[PDB]
């Protein structure tokens, strides 16, 4: 019961403050400890944030050892469309203020928390520098007129309601474009999802057939829709409707719906009166039992109902169901009534409606009848002698087995045997004996293992072969425009001139019924010895009334639009369809009797039924969407997900995704079952589904959404280069960095700079590092060491003191370079900032990582089957000596150095070069970095949700049945 949504990713409103920031701003007044500076350097340090979209990054795992991750990411991406892309910035706060004599509307920085550029500027030194900056803020961060509409609706609208520039304003806010990026997509989403009511009206009203119209008030409301209104936009695309035949579930729904729609309206006389009438025509002796008399009782109305409805469906799609004919006795044809009915019945149904088995029996039962009643004593004998036919008393040799006896009789007739040659040839609608014997479909190509001969099609309907049934393309052009499937219902009968339905077929079978009963026998059936008269009568009236059957043709043709403008109809017989998928019911040709006498044609059609249109096509959209998602998933992956993971695990991803595209728990599994009865998954059926090429493009909506997804993926993919991760970390005896007296922003650090390291050992990968840790050897009498440790000792240790060394106030590093081990492992570095005020009282507590800790690491992961992630800490001391200013001698130089030694000691580290910061010294540029656009409509769009636009049929009316393409 799949209900696809028309707006999968609804827009939500958000405030500028709620935008997630990717940068942090630190402000410090850089001074010197060595000189007396009247004006310290107000500095701004811009660094990356710390929680940068974690659900997608997962720093903990390496996408290079877990292909699974990328798969997971694709999954996330889609959910991000909803969490970020669908949340549209709609409120940037502003106030009325002036800049000189000129009045302006400026963004109220005051309400943007820590992006309050105004406050950030109060950090400058002198009041005037602040004021200037603050006023410059009112100039650059202001609300201005919009240069052009931000939302691009492709629709063609009335100027009056067309979105225009002056309905929007563009704000410049203290956010980097990168930060606002995602939210900008909302405009793209808002576009393909909603449109102006007008469009919806046009769509519905124009694509409406002649007898349907929109409600009066709806039409009015949809029309008078003012500016700024949006309604969900219709999704239209020719789908790959042929998939229905690939999935049991999909086909079962096609059939289910094909049947629910059937509705015939017939009018018949009173069961009574018809009896009373024929009763007179034949002269029924209420004492005598005779054929004519008897049949007048097995005359019921219910039969006609069933019969007609069958004729009806059997005509909508040949591949949903088959009928099982009742009473096909060996010599049923010797019962003129049954006979005549069966022969007529053959004109209301295409071959597709009967079992290829029975269709064959029928031909045989007929051949029996011919040989038994219309063949010369001389003709019979010849056949028997040439082993074409078996003697008639060989009741057992006639029971069916592969061979189509009729075709054989026909193939062996002689020029002079006119009587038979007529009967047969007429039955076979003019085809020659060698034509009737043509194989249309080889048995090995049908789920029912039996050849499809022309002779098995010729007697039914127009007598065309099951594979090339003539289609009812009358409404073809109209369907093609609406984008419905390019296929039609079976042509049950031609429609000529002005609303005149042809009985062309019935006529044919009538003439044949006449030629096989009312013309004369060679050896008349026993039933006819004593009842010849009463029979001729009843049969005479019968043939005279067959045109009454016209009624059925009407009730069917009346619903021309409904029969064709829909997804379920088809006219090509796919013989390979599993016979167990088809539905079936019993049919008694005799029931057709009362129909010939009873049915009363109304000779003009007055009501057409409401077509189903696109109903039931959702299953295809779902299918195509599954394939779409799969292909994407496999593209971002590089290969077929199944090559690497358990199909179940893959499906689970596809499900989650597809379901977000259509707002509904979908289950890929169920579409590919073994049969209609078994729900087991058919890996093979699935494989063929994937093996099939993609015919039609997806509907536009879905294509855009998926493209908007890809952009997000690439966007995130890019934000990868800013998370804290190096491709290597170093192991070293001792280290640190103190740059006392500097005026720079960095004056201390737990780590050092790359060029100060001398690499004397290189550990290739986690494995190798782990391997060395495990090679233990005996050193002396009571001690052991291990290749990794053993290597660590080989490093020169540089006295803590030597790091904080200083000369006359300036830090100096007389020592060489630090001997170190380079470990090429992936690692995350935890950055931390510390501000040095200048008061050297309480030493800072810097987090340092020791060699011992690294070993402790390698031992907790010795068995891991994929490298673990080492989180290496790194502290940076920011110069904030500006708040400290006096020239009085308080302490000894040695004390200061000792203070800074707090930074040294680290044994495991990452170079300071790893830390990527932007450092601004002129407020001006700090602002120029942090500025971006957001164009926003002044008044929120008014989105209409519960609009109810449904077709309504107009009253009774003159219906014209479009005529068939003639010559």
């Amino acid at each position: 019961q799949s209900v696809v949504s028309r707006t999968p990713i609804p827009l939500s409103k958000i405030g500028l403050q709620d935008v997630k920031k990717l940068f942090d701003i630190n402000v410090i007044k850089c001074g010197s400890s060595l000189r007396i500076v009247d004006e310290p350097q107000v500095t701004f340090i811009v660094s990356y944030a710390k929680d940068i979209y974690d659900k997608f990054m997962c720093i903990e795992h390496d996408s290079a050892y877990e292909p699974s991750l990328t798969m997971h990411r694709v999954r996330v991406i889609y959910s991000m469309l909803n969490d970020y892309c669908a949340k549209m910035i709609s409120e940037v706060p502003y106030e009325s203020s002036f800049v000189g004599e000129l009045p302006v509307k400026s963004v109220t920085l005051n309400k943007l928390g820590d992006r309050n550029m105004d406050a950030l500027a109060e950090h400058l030194l002198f009041e005037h520098d602040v004021v200037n900056a603050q006023r410059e803020n009112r100039i650059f961060y202001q609300r201005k007129s919009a240069p052009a509409v931000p939302v691009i609706f492709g629709d063609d609208l009335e100027p009056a309601v067309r979105e225009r520039a002056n309905l929007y304003h563009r704000y410049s806010v203290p956010y980097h474009q990168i930060e606002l990026a995602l939210h900008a997509l909302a405009n793209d989403l808002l576009s393909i999802q909603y449109c102006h009511p007008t469009v919806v009206y046009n769509y519905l009203s124009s694509r409406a057939p002649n007898f349907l119209r929109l409600d009066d008030q709806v039409s009015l409301k949809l029309t008078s829709a003012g500016i700024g209104t949006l309604m969900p936009r219709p999704v239209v695309q020719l789908l790959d409707y042929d998939l229905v035949y690939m999935s049991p579930l999909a086909l079962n729904n096609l059939a289910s719906r094909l049947l629910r729609k059937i509705s015939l309206h017939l009018v018949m006389q009173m069961v009574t009166a018809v009896q009373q009438d024929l009763g007179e025509v034949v002269s029924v002796s209420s004492n005598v039992t005779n054929p004519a008399s008897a049949c007048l009782v097995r005359m019921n109305v219910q039969g006609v109902q069933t019969l007609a409805v069958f004729i009806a469906q059997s005509m909508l799609n040949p591949n949903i169901s088959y009928g099982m004919i009742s009473g096909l006795t060996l010599d049923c044809f010797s019962n003129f009534i049954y006979g005549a009915c069966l022969m007529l019945f053959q004109a209301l149904i295409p071959p597709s409606a009967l079992t290829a088995r029975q269709r064959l029996d029928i031909n045989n039962r007929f051949a029996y009848f011919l040989i038994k009643c219309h063949a010369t004593q001389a003709t019979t004998a010849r056949l028997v002698a040439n082993q074409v036919i078996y003697p008639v008393d060989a009741i057992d040799q006639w029971q069916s087995n592969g061979r189509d006896v009729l075709v054989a009789i026909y193939n062996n007739l002689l020029p002079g045997e006119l009587v038979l040659t007529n009967l047969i040839q007429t039955y076979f609608r003019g085809n020659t004996a060698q034509q009737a014997a043509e194989i249309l479909i080889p048995a090995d190509q049908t789920s029912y293992g039996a050849n499809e001969t022309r002779a098995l099609s010729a007697p039914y309907l127009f007598g065309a072969p099951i594979n090339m049934l003539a289609p009812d393309a009358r409404l073809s052009t109209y369907k093609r425009d609406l984008a419905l499937p390019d296929r039609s219902p079976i042509l049950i009968t031609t429609v000529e001139g002005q609303n005149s339905i042809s009985i062309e077929n019935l006529r044919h079978k009538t003439g044949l019924i006449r030629a096989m009963y009312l013309n004369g026998f060679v050896t008349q059936p026993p039933a006819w010895i004593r009842n010849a008269n009463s029979n001729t009568a009843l049969l005479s009236r019968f043939l005279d009334a067959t045109p009454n059957l016209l009624g059925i043709y009407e009730a069917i043709l009346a619903n021309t639009y409904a029969n064709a403008v829909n997804v379920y109809c088809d006219s090509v017989y796919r013989a390979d369809i599993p016979i167990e998928w088809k539905l079936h019911q019993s049919v008694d040709p005799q029931d057709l009797l009362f129909g010939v006498f009873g049915i009363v044609p109304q000779y003009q059609i007055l009501n057409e039924a409401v077509p189903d249109f696109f109903a039931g096509g959702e299953d295809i959209l779902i299918l195509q969407l599954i394939r779409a998602v799969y292909d994407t998933l496999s593209n971002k992956l590089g290969r077929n997900p199944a090559d690497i993971f358990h199909l179940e695990e893959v499906f689970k991803v596809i499900e989650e995704i597809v379901s977000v595209l259509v707002q509904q728990k979908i289950d890929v599994r169920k579409y590919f079952t073994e049969s209609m009865r078994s729900g087991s998954f058919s890996k093979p059926r699935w494989d063929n589904f994937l093996r099939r090429p993609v015919a039609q493009r997806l509907p536009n909506l879905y294509s855009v959404i998926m493209t908007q997804a890809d952009h997000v993926y690439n966007y995130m993919t890019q934000l990868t280069h800013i998370i804290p991760i190096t491709d290597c970390f170093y192991i070293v005896k001792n280290s640190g960095f103190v740059d006392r007296g500097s005026t720079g922003p960095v004056i201390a650090s737990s780590s050092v700079y790359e060029n100060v390291l001398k690499v004397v050992h290189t550990i290739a990968d986690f494995d190798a590092a782990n391997a060395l840790r495990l090679q233990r050897r005996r050193v002396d009498n009571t001690s052991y060491t291990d290749s990794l440790s053993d290597m660590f000792n080989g490093l020169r240790s540089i006295s803590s003191s030597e790091f904080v060394r200083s000369v006359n106030g300036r830090s100096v590093f007389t020592e060489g370079r630090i001997d170190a081990i380079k470990v090429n492992m992936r690692a995350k570095f935890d950055l931390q900032f510390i501000t040095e005020e200048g008061g050297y009282s309480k030493p800072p507590n810097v987090k340092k990582l020791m060699f011992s800790d690294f070993l402790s690491f390698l031992d907790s992961h010795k068995s891991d089957y994929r490298p673990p992630l080492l989180t290496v800490p790194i502290t940076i001391g920011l110069n904030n000596l500006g708040e400290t200013n006096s020239n009085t001698l308080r302490m000894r130089s040695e004390a200061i150095d000792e203070y800074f030694s707090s930074y040294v000691g680290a044994q495991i580290l990452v170079p300071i070069n790893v830390v990527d910061t932007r450092v601004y010294t002129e407020f001006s540029e700090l602002r120029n970095f942090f500025t971006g656009d957001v164009v926003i409509r002044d008044d929120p769009f008014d989105v209409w949700d519960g609009v109810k636009a449904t077709y309504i049929p107009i009253g009774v009316h003159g219906v014209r049945l479009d005529p068939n393409g003639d010559q």
Binding site: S2, V3, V4, S5, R6, T7, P10, K55, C58, H61, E66, P67, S68, L69, M71, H72, R75, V76, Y78, S79, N82, D83, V200, Y203, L204, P232, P234, V235, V236, Q237, L239, A483, F613, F614, A615, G616, G617, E618, L621, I644, F645, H646, E649, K652, V653, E656, S659, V660, Q663, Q664, K665, P699, Y865, D945, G946, V947, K948, A949, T950
Partner: protein, 49 residues
């Protein structure tokens, strides 16, 4: 009424349950060989032991 199936009937009742799921915790899914290799280990590990 359009390739979506439904017509312009009532309003679309949007279920948020469909996204909030699977997003939360990221549980890695193992590859074939890796999975299998890990089993071969237990087998041999024991035969050896």
């Amino acid at each position: 009424m359009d390739s979506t199936g439904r017509a312009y009937d009532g309003a679309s009742e949007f279920k948020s349950v469909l996204v909030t799921e699977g997003t939360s915790h990221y549980t890695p899914v193992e590859v074939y060989n890796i999975l299998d290799e890990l089993k071969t280990i237990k087998i041999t590990s024991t035969i050896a032991e």
